[PDB]
Design a protein around this ligand. Sequence first.
Ligand code: KS0
Ligand code: KS0
Lengths: 304, 304
Amino acid sequence: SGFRKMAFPSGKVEGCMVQVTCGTTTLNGLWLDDVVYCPRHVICTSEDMLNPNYEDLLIRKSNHNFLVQAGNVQLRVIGHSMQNCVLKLKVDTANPKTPKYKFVRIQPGQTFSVLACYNGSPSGVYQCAMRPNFTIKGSFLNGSCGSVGFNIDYDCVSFCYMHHMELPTGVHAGTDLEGNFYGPFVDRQTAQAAGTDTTITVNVLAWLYAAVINGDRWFLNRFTTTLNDFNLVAMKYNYEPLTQDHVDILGPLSAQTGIAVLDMCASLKELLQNGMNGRTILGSALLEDEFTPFDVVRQCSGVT
Amino acid sequence: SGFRKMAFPSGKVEGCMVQVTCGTTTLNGLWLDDVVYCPRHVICTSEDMLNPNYEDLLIRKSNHNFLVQAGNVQLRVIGHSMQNCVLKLKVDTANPKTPKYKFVRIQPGQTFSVLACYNGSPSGVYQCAMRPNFTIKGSFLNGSCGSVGFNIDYDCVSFCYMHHMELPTGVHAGTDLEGNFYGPFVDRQTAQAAGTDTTITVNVLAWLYAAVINGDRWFLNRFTTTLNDFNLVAMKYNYEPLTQDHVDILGPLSAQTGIAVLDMCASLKELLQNGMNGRTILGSALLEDEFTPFDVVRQCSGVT
Ligand SMILES: *CCC(=O)N1CCN(Cc2ccc(F)cc2)CC1
Ligand SMILES: *CCC(=O)N1CCN(Cc2ccc(F)cc2)CC1
């Protein structure tokens, strides 16, 4: 037992990390097959970021201007092209360490692991969630752009995120592997404020089920509620409204613990209205929302 | 910016994970060079764990009785021996994926990454701290024994932990890579209660410095304190007493932020005596103690 914010093993992603340099700017790239994926702002100078015309800037660039280094070995660039906000650099060698992979665009409320990188070298790994307002709350310093988010299904890596920027608010924004930003964010150094970030209700409930499984039961009560009644409370406390689909994904956890989804909603309702009263749940003093129902099942069963 | 419970990239450790089977019991092993390291209770049947005589049990075992599988390939066992609570199985092949490594015995209050494994396959990675009472608060299900804790210094993996057991309290105990348990724990299914777990004071202060660096400054106050005055408060709240050595390791963070170590102690004192008043620090509603001063510097500078 025990419950931790657990990341996927980062090994398959580490072997794909490269360093991409264009002029004075250096950031991370993702090498899969004979292609290196990186944020298009690698062609920008800090000055350009106020309002870059990426098409005009990329015209001044040739294959030899993109230096791609994998550890200590230089990759030869035979092609370059821009797809939305990412650059695709075709190299002459397929990555021998390319794992089975997919490029997927995750839904808000879903979770993923981030392998933070600097100069193409990995520094650490952590679990993240795509917030409902399409930002992530990561840990990224200068040179971390190009670091990727992923999920792993046995041997297949599903890449879902590429880090592009930190907003003036300290929150993070980026793209899927097709170069499309999550949310309304643009790859420009401008005033960009994230919308109201709601709490992911289905993840809080799934984490409450995880607490019941692992011993923490103080928050359970003699009450029940309905989807409409719970949602009045969820709206007051800036929680996502719960749907029948959310109820259904909670099915496995409801069945294992024997606590009805609406009964757990009544426990959540009382915690929202009364707080924790100085108590903790799974070592946290607040309601955790970065564990999906799938994450809880996986951790409580030991899927490798 | 941003601050996360970040684990080391687990790649170098993934390539060392194997599956060790002895009779009906299967757990994880660590393959470095021509040796496989695993918990000695792999020779036990669930019945034996009440009071196992490991020397007597190991006499009934031969090299052919230890089945060691690395993914899909079987390793040939040419030697076996027990060193404290770990078994060392000499195999006929050096692990081609062995990284540069050390075996180190960490101090209480230090942190490490755990690569949780089942049947020799990695499921996830998380950051842990060796508690002052020598237990860890992990996430381990049946079949996770043999999973290891480590730290990484550029290319050298320092293994510090091997998981051996969950106490009836749900907390975890294990050994260093020489088979010596951290704390008073024995590899036996008996009543074993961890001592009083104190909060790691130097890590809370280092995490407070991390909050100041990353924007959260509400907790800073117009007060200061002394080592003796602070320690009266730390003793009341079951915090480790602060020493001049703790003050000195906080030197880099004190210098970067310009906030004197004793001034930050006065902020910590007020948080202990008054709580958070419903506020948060780095997304946490309690005082985090699983980030060492070294972890904070590393994350705030981007060491790969
Ligand atoms: C790779 C993008 C990223 O996360 N960082 C690089 C730039 N950093 C500074 C920054 C912060 C906020 C801004 F509005 C612009 C630049 C932060 C880390
Ligand atoms: C590898 C040891 C471990 O963490 N586990 C295996 C046994 N599990 C059950 C257990 C719990 C508490 C006990 F006192 C004995 C056995 C938990 C996970």
